[PDB]
Design an enzyme around this catalytic site. Structure first.
Site, PDB file in Angstrom:
ATOM      1  CD  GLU A 185      -1.416  -8.725  19.485  1.00 42.69           C
ATOM      2  OE1 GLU A 185      -0.550  -9.611  19.304  1.00 42.69           O
ATOM      3  OE2 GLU A 185      -1.846  -7.987  18.573  1.00 42.69           O
ATOM      4  CD1 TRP A 213      -1.351  -3.943  18.774  1.00 47.89           C
ATOM      5  CD2 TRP A 213      -2.740  -3.064  17.261  1.00 47.89           C
ATOM      6  NE1 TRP A 213      -1.803  -4.969  17.983  1.00 47.89           N
ATOM      7  CE2 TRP A 213      -2.657  -4.457  17.044  1.00 47.89           C
ATOM      8  CE3 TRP A 213      -3.561  -2.290  16.424  1.00 47.89           C
ATOM      9  CZ2 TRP A 213      -3.368  -5.100  16.021  1.00 47.89           C
ATOM     10  CZ3 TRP A 213      -4.273  -2.928  15.406  1.00 47.89           C
ATOM     11  CH2 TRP A 213      -4.168  -4.323  15.213  1.00 47.89           C
ATOM     12  CG  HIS A 245       5.293  -9.589   1.976  1.00 48.40           C
ATOM     13  ND1 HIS A 245       3.949  -9.727   2.234  1.00 48.40           N
ATOM     14  CD2 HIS A 245       5.757  -8.672   2.857  1.00 48.40           C
ATOM     15  CE1 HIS A 245       3.612  -8.925   3.228  1.00 48.40           C
ATOM     16  NE2 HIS A 245       4.691  -8.272   3.625  1.00 48.40           N
ATOM     17  CB  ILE A 246      10.916 -10.778   3.063  1.00 50.32           C
ATOM     18  CG1 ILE A 246      11.674 -10.639   1.765  1.00 50.32           C
ATOM     19  CG2 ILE A 246      10.546 -12.221   3.179  1.00 50.32           C
ATOM     20  CD1 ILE A 246      13.114 -11.025   1.894  1.00 50.32           C
ATOM     21  CE1 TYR A 247       6.987  -3.724   2.613  1.00 56.22           C
ATOM     22  CE2 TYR A 247       6.802  -4.687   4.810  1.00 56.22           C
ATOM     23  CZ  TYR A 247       6.221  -4.040   3.718  1.00 56.22           C
ATOM     24  OH  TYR A 247       4.879  -3.729   3.706  1.00 56.22           O
ATOM     25  CE1 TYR A 304      -6.872 -10.475  13.628  1.00 55.53           C
ATOM     26  CE2 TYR A 304      -5.683  -8.555  14.437  1.00 55.53           C
ATOM     27  CZ  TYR A 304      -5.878  -9.526  13.471  1.00 55.53           C
ATOM     28  OH  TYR A 304      -5.104  -9.536  12.336  1.00 55.53           O
ATOM     29  NE  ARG A 317      -5.487  -8.712   5.460  1.00 53.56           N
ATOM     30  CZ  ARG A 317      -4.433  -7.906   5.495  1.00 53.56           C
ATOM     31  NH1 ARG A 317      -3.417  -8.105   4.681  1.00 53.56           N
ATOM     32  NH2 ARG A 317      -4.386  -6.909   6.364  1.00 53.56           N
ATOM     33  CB  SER A 318      -0.693  -9.679   4.456  1.00 54.73           C
ATOM     34  OG  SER A 318       0.598  -9.100   4.454  1.00 54.73           O
ATOM     35  N   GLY A 319       1.624 -11.706   5.105  1.00 52.21           N
ATOM     36  CA  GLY A 319       2.586 -12.166   6.082  1.00 52.21           C
ATOM     37  C   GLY A 319       3.997 -11.652   5.903  1.00 52.21           C
ATOM     38  CG  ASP A 320       7.153  -8.335   7.838  1.00 50.51           C
ATOM     39  OD1 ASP A 320       8.192  -9.010   7.677  1.00 50.51           O
ATOM     40  OD2 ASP A 320       7.173  -7.100   8.044  1.00 50.51           O
ATOM     41  NE  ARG A 370     -15.482 -33.540   8.947  1.00 48.29           N
ATOM     42  CZ  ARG A 370     -14.660 -34.466   9.450  1.00 48.29           C
ATOM     43  NH1 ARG A 370     -14.654 -34.741  10.756  1.00 48.29           N
ATOM     44  NH2 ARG A 370     -13.864 -35.159   8.643  1.00 48.29           N
ATOM     45  NE  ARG A 371     -21.341 -26.591  11.664  1.00 50.48           N
ATOM     46  CZ  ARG A 371     -22.496 -26.893  11.085  1.00 50.48           C
ATOM     47  NH1 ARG A 371     -22.528 -27.809  10.124  1.00 50.48           N
ATOM     48  NH2 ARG A 371     -23.618 -26.279  11.458  1.00 50.48           N
ATOM     49  NE  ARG A 398      -3.244   1.633  -0.173  1.00 48.13           N
ATOM     50  CZ  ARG A 398      -4.099   2.613  -0.471  1.00 48.13           C
ATOM     51  NH1 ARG A 398      -5.186   2.788   0.269  1.00 48.13           N
ATOM     52  NH2 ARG A 398      -3.872   3.413  -1.512  1.00 48.13           N
ATOM     53  CB  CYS A 436      -2.377  -9.954   8.805  1.00 41.81           C
ATOM     54  SG  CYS A 436      -1.745  -8.437   8.030  1.00 41.81           S
TER      55      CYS A 436
END
Lengths: 283, 283
Positions: free
Chosen positions: A62, A84, A231-233, A110, A190-193, A150-151, A25, A170
């Protein structure tokens, strides 16, 4: 008997070798692969990465904060974890458009999503009880009455509440699984640093699994971690190259001292990690 | 090139060779495994189970039916597909305790969520226009504006629309990823039947890809199929053993004929499969 951290270190090897450039972003470029999955064991072990120190006091601090349902970063910044607070600050806060929001008000994150799903979000101080839906408990319950279910899922993503939160989760969803009185968990991020974030999550959700297996009298099992955009910066490539070399140390052990019955009662002073010996620093 | 079906047939040899026993609802027994994730390439070939014929019709029909935003099973049966036709009777509805439910009514299912997430459901008939969050559209929308964003999630799971829903979401959610004009999609299955279910679901979410791609002038990338509770019904034991013998045939090619602009104007006869060579089932 292969080690857990090799799973994480390995994913990094992959991202570096085949990851393609992709901005975020902020437009910042990163190397990235899409769709991964690691499986860390929680059997008398704790997946707190050993090739680099992990912010345990933050992980714990947290986590309880969420259990409390607290959605005000100011109710955690005073707990000694400032990861945060910059989302509640007048500047960025009003910057998002919610210029009418109180300082410290993060919104329906959350916490509110784990206890008051679909619940019309009022404010970070507004009473929400019986208000909405509490999956954190409903999860606990199901485990107890019918572990074959299973739910047993606990979504935190809310399309409705999405354009009203300090920032999208995320943590898409986590579904618990039970077999032979063992409590397995799968988290879908969804996203992961992979650099300075992913390791902090492996903990956070290995912890919750340990807390629930506790309450439910179940025993810790496997913690599966699934990622979308892994990903990784670029800043991190170099450091990670070195850390990529460090050999992983024996995962510590997590022990809870006070036997608790209500997950909402758990307290920071209730856990003590024993054996955490990570490697110094890299930079 | 390493065949892709080796994935599915690879996840099956594990489920058997290492799955524990885990019974379910109407309680038949089944060997299970929690946490899995195959990756299917959508480059110049469609991932269609070759070792066993697939109801390509129902797959094609079901989807268009999902796009429609239809919760009326009969509406899907009308196209000559009776898979979701289980609940298409006053027998199942009441079986859950549904009287007002006019037969066929599946409740706030997928299509209703895709197009009307969080919308207030009445029943099959009501005009839900502008009621809720249409993840579907908002998805193709975002794929065009900024495909660099990692929030292309299509969540079909909703805790408030569960007690009223017919058959719980066997696809909690899915996430889209684009890069270098490539479109990839990973689907999260809270539960999948590695016997006579996964094949369909696989093809069923690969297609939606090809469609979204085509509508956004993008090229189909990868399809990551991430499973939660991946099980093989005891019943399906004997057969799946030998199916593990018949080497996998080349994955089909789904050629589009004409240019729909948006998923909605897609027609059943818009998909011509080329080269589909599946094995002759025994039972």
């Amino acid at each position: 008997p292969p080690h857990g951290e090799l799973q994480y270190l390995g994913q990094i090897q992959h991202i570096l070798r085949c990851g393609v450039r992709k901005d975020d972003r902020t437009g910042t470029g990163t190397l990235s692969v899409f769709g991964m999955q690691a499986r860390y064991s929680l059997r008398d072990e704790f997946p707190l990465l050993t090739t680099k120190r992990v912010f345990w006091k933050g992980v714990l601090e947290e986590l309880l904060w969420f259990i409390k349902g607290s959605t005000n970063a100011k109710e955690l910044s005073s707990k000694g974890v400032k990861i945060w607070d910059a989302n509640g600050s007048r500047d960025f806060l009003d910057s998002l458009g919610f210029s009418t929001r109180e300082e410290g008000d993060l919104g329906p994150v959350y916490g509110f999503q784990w206890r008051h799903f679909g619940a019309e979000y009022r404010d970070m101080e507004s009473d929400y009880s019986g208000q909405g839906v509490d999956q954190l408990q409903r999860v606990i319950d199901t485990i107890k009455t019918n572990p074959d279910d299973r739910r047993i899922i606990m979504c935190a993503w809310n399309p409705r509440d999405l354009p009203l939160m300090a920032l999208p989760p995320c943590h898409a969803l986590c579904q618990f699984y039970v077999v032979n009185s063992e409590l397995s968990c799968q988290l879908y991020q969804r996203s992961g640093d992979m650099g300075l974030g992913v390791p902090f999550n492996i903990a956070s959700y290995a912890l919750l699994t340990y807390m629930i297996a506790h309450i439910t009298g179940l025993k810790p099992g496997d913690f599966i971690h699934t990622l979308g955009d892994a990903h990784i910066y670029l800043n991190h490539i170099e450091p990670l190259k070195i850390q990529l070399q460090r050999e992983p140390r024996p995962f510590p052990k997590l022990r809870i001292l006070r036997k608790v019955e209500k997950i909402d009662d758990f307290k920071a002073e209730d856990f003590q990690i024993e054996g955490y010996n990570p490697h110094p620093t890299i930079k």
